[model samples]
Target: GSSGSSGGEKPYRCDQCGKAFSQKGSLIVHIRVHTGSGPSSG
Candidate 1:
């Protein structure tokens, strides 16, 4: 996760794995593609 003044306004939730993330783009890509038979599903 980024360590800076990150605006806490765009929180995204992963419906696939039932999780939430402060960073949407990275988390979405990681979860969306990652959940697709990937090893980095955490």
Candidate 2:
């Protein structure tokens, strides 16, 4: 059995912001910031 790790793999990245994430979900969440719709209560 092989546990998938980040070995030899590149992180997901945002071209607009140059942000890198280990997971696709994280990358998608980060993209919301570029649209100005992320993690802000105001």
Candidate 3:
């Protein structure tokens, strides 16, 4: 099964869970999990 995208220009990555995002903005939101700060209206 696939959880995130494969290798490429997908530079946005979440080291906390090894999740790759197409945009850095989304990656910022995904980081909430590690801090438990909830959503940011993105």
Candidate 4:
């Protein structure tokens, strides 16, 4: 789980949109949209 701590990890950036995310999972989720994929419930 992410602690939302500054030292946990640096934010991730999207090269396509310049969007940022604090967690890698968030970045991956965002990338799926570019691929025309929707979010998974599980």
Candidate 5:
């Protein structure tokens, strides 16, 4: 069986802090915490 990208989806998780994000943008911000980068102006 093949399951296409549809229906309910999964979350993005950060291994460093074991945190889960519902949005990709949120995960990117979390990664910045470790990389010492400022948040994106969006």
Candidate 6:
């Protein structure tokens, strides 16, 4: 089974959007889109 860690093997996905992330930083930036706080977030 996939452990679903921040960065292990499987990518992280946001609850609202289906975007995936490989690391915490990327996920952090990606999540900003959900909150409409990212630069040119789309």
Per-candidate TM-scores read 0.38, 0.50, 0.58, 0.52, 0.53, 0.46
- Model 1: colliding residue pairs: none
Ranking by TM-score: 3, 5, 4, 2, 6, 1
What's model 4's overall lDDT?
0.70
Clashing pairs in 4: none
**Which stretch of 10 consecutive residues in model 4 shows the poorest summed lDDT?**
2-11
Writing each residue's lDDT as its tens digit, candidate 6 over 1-42 gives 876455444457677865566676888776665776658734
- On TM-score, the stronger of 5 and 6 is 5
Model 6 misplaced regions, further than 4 Å: 1-11, 36-42
Which one wins on lDDT?
Answer: 3
- Could you tell which candidate, 2 or 6, scores higher by TM-score? 2
lDDT of 6 at 26: 81
Off-target runs (Cα >4 Å) in candidate 5 are 1-9, 36-42
Q: What does candidate 5 score on TM?
A: 0.53
Report lDDT (CA) for all predictions. Answer: 0.60, 0.68, 0.75, 0.70, 0.70, 0.65
Task: Identify the superior model by TM-score, candidate 2 or candidate 3.
Answer: 3
Which digits, one per residue and each the tens of the lDDT, describe model 5 over residues 1-42?
895544434478677976666788887777776876676555
- Scanning candidate 2 in windows of ten residues, the lowest lDDT window is 2-11
Tell me the deviation in Å of residue 28 in model 5. 0.7
Backbone clash pairs for candidate 5 read: none
lDDT of 1: 0.60
lDDT of 1 by residue, 1-42 (tens): 766553455568666665566775668566646556445545
Model 5's C-alpha root-mean-square deviation from the true structure amounts to: 9.5
